UniProtKB/Swiss-Prot annotation, chain A:
This is DNA-directed RNA polymerase subunit beta. Belongs to the RNA polymerase beta chain family. DNA-dependent RNA polymerase catalyzes the transcription of DNA into RNA using the four ribonucleoside triphosphates as substrates. In plastids the minimal PEP RNA polymerase catalytic core is composed of four subunits: alpha, beta, beta', and beta''. When a (nuclear-encoded) sigma factor is associated with the core the holoenzyme is formed, which can initiate transcription. It is found in: Plastid, Chloroplast. It comes from the Eukaryota.
Length: 58, 50
C-alpha cells in the first residue's frame, strides 16, 4: 500500500522480490522434487516438505 | 488618517487552530502521517476552505 502518498524506496523492488522468493519459491521447488524409492533392506526416507526451516547465519 | 482604511480583527490569538471540527466518513491510518496528505487532495465538504 506504500508509495501512493510518497516516493517509494529505491530498494523496494529487490526487497519484495527476495521476500516473495524466500516465501513461496522454495516450497514450490521442494514440492516438485521427485521421490527416490530404493534400499529395501536399508532404512531411508523421501523428501517431505513439512519442516522447511532456515537458520540464521553464524 | 492614512489612506488605506484600518480594520480591527477582534478575537483570540492561536498558532494553528481549526474551529470547524465535524465527523468525517472516510478515514486514514492511525500512525502513518505520511499518508494523511491524501485527505487534503479530496477533503471532506466542511474542510475544503477552513
Amino acid at each position: 500500500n506504500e508509495g501512493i502518498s510518497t516516493i517509494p524506496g529505491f530498494n523496494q523492488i529487490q526487497f519484495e522480490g527476495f521476500c516473495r522468493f524466500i516465501d513461496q519459491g522454495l516450497t514450490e521447488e521442494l514440492y516438485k522434487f521427485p521421490k527416490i524409492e530404493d534400499t529395501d533392506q536399508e532404512i531411508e526416507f523421501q523428501l517431505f516438505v513439512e519442516t522447511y526451516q532456515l537458520v540464521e547465519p553464524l | 488618517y492614512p489612506n488605506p482604511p484600518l480594520v480591527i480583527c477582534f478575537g483570540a490569538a492561536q498558532k494553528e487552530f481549526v474551529p470547524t471540527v465535524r465527523v468525517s466518513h472516510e478515514q486514514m491510518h492511525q500512525d502513518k502521517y505520511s499518508e494523511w496528505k491524501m485527505l487534503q487532495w479530496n477533503p471532506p465538504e466542511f474542510v475544503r476552505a477552513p
